[model samples]
Each structure stands twice: as structure tokens, then as C-alpha cells.
Target: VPRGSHMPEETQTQDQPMEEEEVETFAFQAEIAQLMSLIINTFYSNKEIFLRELISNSSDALDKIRYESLTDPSKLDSGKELHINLIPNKQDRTLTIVDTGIGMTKADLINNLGTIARSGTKAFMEALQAGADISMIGQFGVGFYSAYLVAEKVTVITKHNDDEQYAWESSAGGSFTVRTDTGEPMGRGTKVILHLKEDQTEYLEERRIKEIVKKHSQFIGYPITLFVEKER
Candidate 1:
């Protein structure tokens, strides 16, 4: 018997009609694109805000899994910890933020990050419909593009339910690259690594980032952790 309506015959399943036809991608209005450009231009007036933005995104990732667990509590493995780790390496001039939360598949990464300039409006509206908390990711439409502001290079390592861990990389010039991750990680999540420019070295200070966190996100629910070396 079928879950709902019983099958009339064994051939019914095979004879069933195909799903709805695919539609073309939606187009963004010129105004929407210009709006994003304008926001990107001003993304750095408060550069310290990046810490808060990243932490908030981590919290949302955690919440996403927790929400899924409401119906399937076993979706996650043991030791469900909702925390974000910020590690800055002055020698390498890199900053990496890691979180154990719902992450992106390769398609998700391409569609989300790569298509921002073209389809961000529709994607954002759909995200809202899917119960995504807009406030956390800082509008989602434009804020992510800001990663290019401070980083000469940006890399994201992500693992998701149906895909192996992979790394997505890009230069500030718009194009990007993706490859499977070779390093070991406990489980599914995302790590965003920022290859900082010389002018942005101030972000390497743990204390400076902590102050920004306290200022913009002290009341935020998730725990934000900083990994620092004794000598900077």
C-alpha cells in the first residue's frame, strides 16, 4: 500500500507522470543590483562589524540544525555543541571562523555565493519563506559580498548531509574555485577563511575582535570563541 493513496497497480509507480517542468531562473531588477553595489561600497565603514556578522551566521547555522532536530532529533551526531571559533594567524595573515552547524553542499555553495550578484533577491525571498532568520546573516543579499572587502582571497570549507567536505575559494575579482577538502574534521559544518590584506591586520587581534563581539553581539544566543596564540 502507498503511504497515502493506494497504488492502483504495480505499473502505476512507473507510469506516473513526471514532476512539473523546470522554469528558467528569475532575473533581478537593475535597481536591486545597484542596491547591492551601493551596500558593498559602504560595507567597510564599520569593518569591525564583520566579527559580529560571522558570529551571527554561525548561530544561525546552529539554529538550523536544531530546528531540523525538532522532528528528527537524531539528525546530528553526539556532542551537539553550538559554538563559533575565530582563529587569526598573523604570520599567514589569515583569519578563519569555524562552526559546527548546517553547512552547504557544492550546489548550495555555487548557488548561494556564486549567484549573489544575479539571483540574490529571489534567493533571499525564498530563504525568508523557508524560515531563515534574516537578522542573523545581516540581510544575506549584500553582506556576504563584503567578504571581498578585507580579504584578498576567501575560502570556505563546508560539509553537508549529502555531500563530502569541500573547499570553495575565490579572489576578490569575482570568480571562484571549489575542490574537495583533504583535511580532517569531526563532522558537518562550515569554515570561512579570510586571507587578510595588509591594511586589515588589525582584525588579527583577539582582544579587538572580542570587543567588537561584545559591542555588536553580547546578547546573541550562541557562544563565540576565539583561538589565539600566546605571541601574536
Candidate 2:
């Protein structure tokens, strides 16, 4: 969570097709894997809550950058507003949440996403063993994995002020892959794409997305933009 607080080996199996670019594949540590399963099945009572969690994370990312900008105002030089954007595509059943907040370096992606519990994986496991309800755990930073609750596949494209843009992808299977993203650079911020499952098609509706935003994140400090034309 601090400013200064923040993956080379290519891992491809013989059965995996070789891409023009090499992507590193990493299996979630056994403990982390079990944690993800718990999250998918027991974390939230309703799948729509995933949107709330994702937006909250974006707000946190923007807060981090804004705080860092106090020491160096240029961190906000991208001329982008500190806002969150939700783009839902009904035809493809995909939803993308974008934020012009502090993005992640490749190392950040690997450490944050590749691993299960960021701060204290072992302690979390111990607490679980003691029968601590998963919801009782605080600041574990595993909330990002909630995307897998409704998405068949998730893609995170991000660029940190200190590093070039990269993409982290996973099917919520047992593993994930990371590689350089040659698409249009994010400049500064993060973009999350959710390939929604068939049953999760409601998320692609504009009204549904707006209602969820209003219900969960309306009081959040940063602007939550469900439609570009609306004012927060």
C-alpha cells in the first residue's frame, strides 16, 4: 500500500501453442488455489457484488496515485480525470471497467495477482485453519480475484508510471499467464476486461450496471461513471 512498496522465466508446456510472444505461466500456490475456490463459492452471496469490489479497487488505485502525486504532482500529468468507466457490451457479453488511476508494473501484476494473499498468505491460512470466517480477514488484498466470480476469463491491462504497459490474463482455471501488451498504451491507469459467463449477461445491460454502481459505490469519493454523459 506504500508508494515504494512495489517475472522473466517463460513457462510454456509442449501442449500449449507457442505464440509470437512468450507469456509466462504460473500456477497458483496450493494454498492460494484453495483460497480462490473459497472465494468463488463462498465469498459473496450474489455475483453482482463483483462489480462493487472492482470499482472499490479502482478507487483505491486512484487514491494511491493521488497520494503519491502530493510529493510529485506530475504523476497526474496524463490529463485524465480521476474517474471510473464502465463499458458493457451486450453483443459480446463483455464488460470493461477502466480507471485512470495508478497502474501496475509487471512485477506488481505478478506479485499481486500471481500470488493468492499479498500481505500474509501463511497467516491467512493459519487463521482459516482456526475456523476464522473468510469474511473476517481484513486487508488481505485478494479481492481482485473476485472477478472470476462472474467472468469466464479476465484480462487486466495496466501501465505504471515507472513501467511500460503489460497484460495479465486468467481463465480462473488453476493458472494464469502474463505477457507484454502491444495494444494502445494506457498512458497511466488500469483497464479490466471481463469475458462474462452466459448466465452473467445481465451485467452487460446499461441500466443494471448503473443500478449496481448507485447501490454500492454511489457514496464513494471518486466519480463512478456508468455512462460517459452523466455527471457524478
| Residue ranges of candidate 1 with Cα displaced over 4 Å | 1-43, 116-137
lDDT of 2 by residue, 95-145 (tens): 999998889998888878866456666676577567665543344556676
Write model 1 residue lDDT over 26-64, tens digit each, in one string: 222443444344433433356666666766777788888
Error of 2 at 185 (Å): 1.7
Q: Cα lDDT for residue 133, model 1? A: 46
Q: Which candidate has the highest TM-score of all? A: 2
Alpha-carbon local distance difference test for all models: 0.68, 0.76
Where does candidate 1 clash, by residue pair? none
Most lDDT-accurate candidate: 2
